[PDB]
Design a protein around this ligand. Sequence first.
Ligand SMILES: [K+]
Lengths: 43, 669, 639, 149
Amino acid sequence: ETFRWLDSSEHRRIETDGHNDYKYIIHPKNRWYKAWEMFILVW
Amino acid sequence: NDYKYIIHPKNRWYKAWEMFILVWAIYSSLFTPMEFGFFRGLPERLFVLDIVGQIAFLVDIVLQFFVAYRDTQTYRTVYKPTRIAFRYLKSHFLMDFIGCFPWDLIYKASGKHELVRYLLWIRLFRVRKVVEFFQRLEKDTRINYLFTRILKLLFVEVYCTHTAACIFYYLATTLPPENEGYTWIGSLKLGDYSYENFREIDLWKRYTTALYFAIVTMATVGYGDIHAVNLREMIFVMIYVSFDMVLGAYLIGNITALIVKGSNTERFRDKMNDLISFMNRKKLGRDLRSQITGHVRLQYDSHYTDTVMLQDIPASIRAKIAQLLYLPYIKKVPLFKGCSTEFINQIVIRLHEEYFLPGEVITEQGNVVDHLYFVCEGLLEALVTKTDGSEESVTLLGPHTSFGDISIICNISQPFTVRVCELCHLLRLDKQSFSNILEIYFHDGRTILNNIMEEKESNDRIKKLESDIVIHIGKQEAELALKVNSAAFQGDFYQLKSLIRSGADPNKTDYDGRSPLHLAACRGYEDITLFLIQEGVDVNLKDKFGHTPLFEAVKAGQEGVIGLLVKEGASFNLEDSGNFLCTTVAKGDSDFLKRLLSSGMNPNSEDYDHRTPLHVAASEGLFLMAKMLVEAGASVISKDRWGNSPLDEARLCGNKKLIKLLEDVKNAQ
Amino acid sequence: ETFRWLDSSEHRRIETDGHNDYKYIIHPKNRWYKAWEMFILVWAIYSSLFTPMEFGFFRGLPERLFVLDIVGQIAFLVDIVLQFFVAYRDTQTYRTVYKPTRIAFRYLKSHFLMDFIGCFPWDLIYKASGKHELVRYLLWIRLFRVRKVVEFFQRLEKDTRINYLFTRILKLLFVEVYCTHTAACIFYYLATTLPPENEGYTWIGSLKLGDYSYENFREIDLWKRYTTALYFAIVTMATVGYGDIHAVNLREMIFVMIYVSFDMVLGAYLIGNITALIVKGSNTERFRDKMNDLISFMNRKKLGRDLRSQITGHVRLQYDSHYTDTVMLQDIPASIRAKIAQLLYLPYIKKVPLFKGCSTEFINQIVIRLHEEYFLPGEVITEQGNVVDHLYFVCEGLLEALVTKTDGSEESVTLLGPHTSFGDISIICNISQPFTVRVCELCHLLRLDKQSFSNILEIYFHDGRTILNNIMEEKESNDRIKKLESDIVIHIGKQEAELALKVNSAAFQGDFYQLKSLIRSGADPNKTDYDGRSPLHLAACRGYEDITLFLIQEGVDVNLKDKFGHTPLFEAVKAGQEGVIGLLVKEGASFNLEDSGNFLCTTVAKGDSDFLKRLLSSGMNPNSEDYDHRTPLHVAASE
Amino acid sequence: QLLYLPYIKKVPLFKGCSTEFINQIVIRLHEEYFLPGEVITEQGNVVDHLYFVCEGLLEALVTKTDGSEESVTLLGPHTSFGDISIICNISQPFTVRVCELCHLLRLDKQSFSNILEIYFHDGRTILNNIMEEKESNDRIKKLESDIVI
Ligand SMILES: [K+]
């Protein structure tokens, strides 16, 4: 029943999947990925 | 379909011909203004193109005589040829038949008159097929409504610009070539190019020039490099701009109307936007804000189960929906066990789905409830509460359970604040509809009252002969006991059984005793008494007069029902039996006393004076009945309150023919 | 309080003010006067279109068009004096006033002088008074004859056949044109206001379109100058504006700056009214709104592919044809909805063969609780082997009752055409539905519930017995399938066998309203079946009343010996009781009882001074005796 | 208290009541209008609202089975039908039609029972007024309704 309620639900589980491994992957809502998303926006 | 030569309109080989003649009608109604305006008879390059093209619309006329249609008043497909023929001949045959005449060959073989060339303007009764295509596309939910509502308005603004360009060039051709300077194209010079002697310019330069004027005019840009100089072209562009002004206003109106009539996503978006503005204005917390947003998102994503979308669908279709969705969730409920299927079909119609997040509150402690809830999924809990903030998890209401039924039938406030611990799927049912169908179906309300008492063993409120739901049931059960007793009085054995098999009880009594066994025994209907005994009845039931059905059987006189009641526990239990036996000796009806001590009361009982019935029998001379009264009675030595054995009482009667009986029990000592 | 609402009530008072006196004042709905209103509307349309063309394009009318505007002024001079004899359909006091001093007034202080100045000859006055230019500006008074066109669009806005937001669009489209006709006439007049030697500094004297030069422009034909000016004004109104014709003077620049500022507001108002018409949605998008609201809840509930095609079929049936507007009808109260139902359904229910001559109140109670329903062909309504929850009456269409033997042998039992009912032989009975009622043609069934046709069937017991007699006076249902049930529910006694029991249970429970609703409709007996009881034997005494009014009604027979030998005085005195035995004795109650002496000796023997003093106080002679002829003193001296 | 209070003060049901009870009554009223001829209550029904006439000439008639009727009274202004069907929990015995342009004031039965159970001295005064004006032919007891309990 709750699998119908996917995005209308708890939705905050990024904490475990943050830095499992791979050591390079930048989060989208970073701060250095907001000095790029405006610099190359005005580019 | 007993014809086999009539095509169904929803065929898959005919629906490939509709989209073929749609393409041929999109072409042949866009070339027809170009054939009227830009030529004066077609060249020999386009002769074969004009011959086939009036043939694909000539076999379509024949094919429309062999296609069934749906009737408008009976909604049946009409496969009759003489009906589809007379439907085609009176609706669309004439404008499609004279439209596919070879009008160019009729023009060239009539001395080339210009008025026989205006007759090819009835080939625009082929945008009828585009109109029918858009009408079929509007009555199909697979296609979007922003793809259809203005796309058909960006089609009239193609047709009425191409046609206006063709008429605007045609008006330039209506003046002779000596008067070319007084025309819109003859007086035209764009750049270093001059459009003089314009009928030897190639077709696509003239067409692109006229269409450039028509589209720049239609968009109300209007550069004025191309304008009208004549007095016929002034009139035409006045008509044309006064038509495209309201056409552009209609386009802006349709786009604005489909923008201001937004989807439910935008309404929910602005609702969540100003709710988030209220939550950030009031400085709310973290889990509280998530609870508010989750509740309104649950309501938006789950409000689609509202039954007010369905209140034009008829009953026995809404009932089938409610029996497909809700009936397996009501059949497995411990409250409704033993209830008939009619009551459950009346239950499932008036149910409303509800969803709650894990932590909201459904019912509260101090409140009398107004909805009976059924749990489909979820793991709701029941919390009684004290004055000093205490909580006690009394009951864990899982799936297949109900709460609030005790607070409706007994009309009490709710005992438990019901908080929900999971994502639940509750089913509302208001107390008014529940109570109404309880006093409508009282034979199932009695079984509900018997189910509500057991689980709680009536923790309290047990008589609960307080709320009407528990009264109206008592009143209807009483009047149905009256009705089944009237059926049992006269011979209505089939009617009696139809009353009993409709959920009755053959043990509920009348206003003063009077079970159906009582009336069936006093009337002597032996089959009815067999049905009542094998159904299961208290055969020793008493009245407000102190009467058993055995007593009414022996008072009536039918020995068959007398013998039929005594094969079970007949058992008279009659109080004041002594004075009753003495007063039936007093009335002296000997066959009634034969019925009395046949299988019954002991004849050694006593009246207010301590005397046996054989004492009062042997006081006037009643040998024919004193013989009967001495048949089973014993202990003949018994004195009165006066102190008299019945032998010395039988002495002074003055009749000696019953003293012959007095030498009978002289050996039992 | 009808002075507060003179609009909701007192709408059409007609009687006492049609022919008061004066016999001349025409009501403003006469067929001979509304044939003059269209005539003066055509004259007003012509005289308002020709007036700017008379002003701008001429300096005094020629020798022709003289009889034309003479009769144009005569046809309005007639209408000037004709409105002194036309009534005064009023605003606040809703009655057509016939008083011809409130007809001369309300007109003289209104459109009279603007309509009497406009009938003076202003081109004979012009040519008589030395040909002055400012006496020709009084032709513009004749644009007050657009009242007759704006009154036509007010008598059309309150006409319900055409949408009011469409008459507003037609009114704006008659304001858009005639403001391009008047602007064309003023734009040509502003070119004639310059001398003919300064004609090269005008919009038309400095014009050259194609190879034709518009020089010496006062000698061109009138229909070339008018078409040129109107072409400018219409391509300016549409905001196309080619610029082949443009303003040249300052007096033309000022007029174009006024005119495009007026047309911008007018075009924005036209776009707004068209958009306001379109947002009031059509039939197709109001179908598709709830259709996409019902495709979802059919995709997530996972309904079957046949039930989905039935639901979509019924939704496409309530739209696109057969506009069942009960959802609009629900604002109307129950009394007026009952009057609507008695108008619409009584021609159909009275011709049903089930109701062969019942009472009119019973058929009224039937048609109060009816619902209209439409079904496509191929639908199954009531299938064989299920309980019947609704009673259906076929108003129009064609149905089909079928039955199967073993292997789906669907043979046509009957064909239920119009004025037929099905589901009737199983609400009367308590059996299953015996036929699969399938739909052949598009039907219009009238649905009655099962519980309504049990309440109004047990209330109206004479009509219920008439309905059972209508069912049995048939071929005993061998026209259908010969499913004979006994003889239906047979005569089941609701005359005396259950109604005396019903009124006796009403007396036993103590319901006075049910008691008097039963007995004031007749049928007050003195006997119960299955016993010798009475509505006096129950209520009065044993119950001891509940309700004090149980003894005064109808004066029923006291001293009725029941099946167990108890008079109602004995039942009132056994339960002791002290109101009915105080009250029954003045009504002539008696203590008749067989072996009363033996009963008194037994009440001596048990010992009950209250019981025996209530026996003796309510009338009892203690010299009656028993089988041994012993008085109650002979046993009250025993122990 | 300035729109409805002169109407509710001169009601024979609320005679002798405290002014605070009337001030609690007048808040929950709903102004209603009816043209001369509709029906607002029927023959057998426990009524859902208590009404007060302000300017109107409603009639209260009892219907029979065979279509007939007779008016037991003529409810003019400053009258209150309803209440005896509410506070005795019985059905309203009269089909209350209307003969003029009436000016009723609704009051639902749950809120009326709430104000009666909170202010019980005025409830006893209302019970006394109904027991003398209806004359209390029976149910001087009237413990069938939980309001009196
Ligand atoms: K322009």
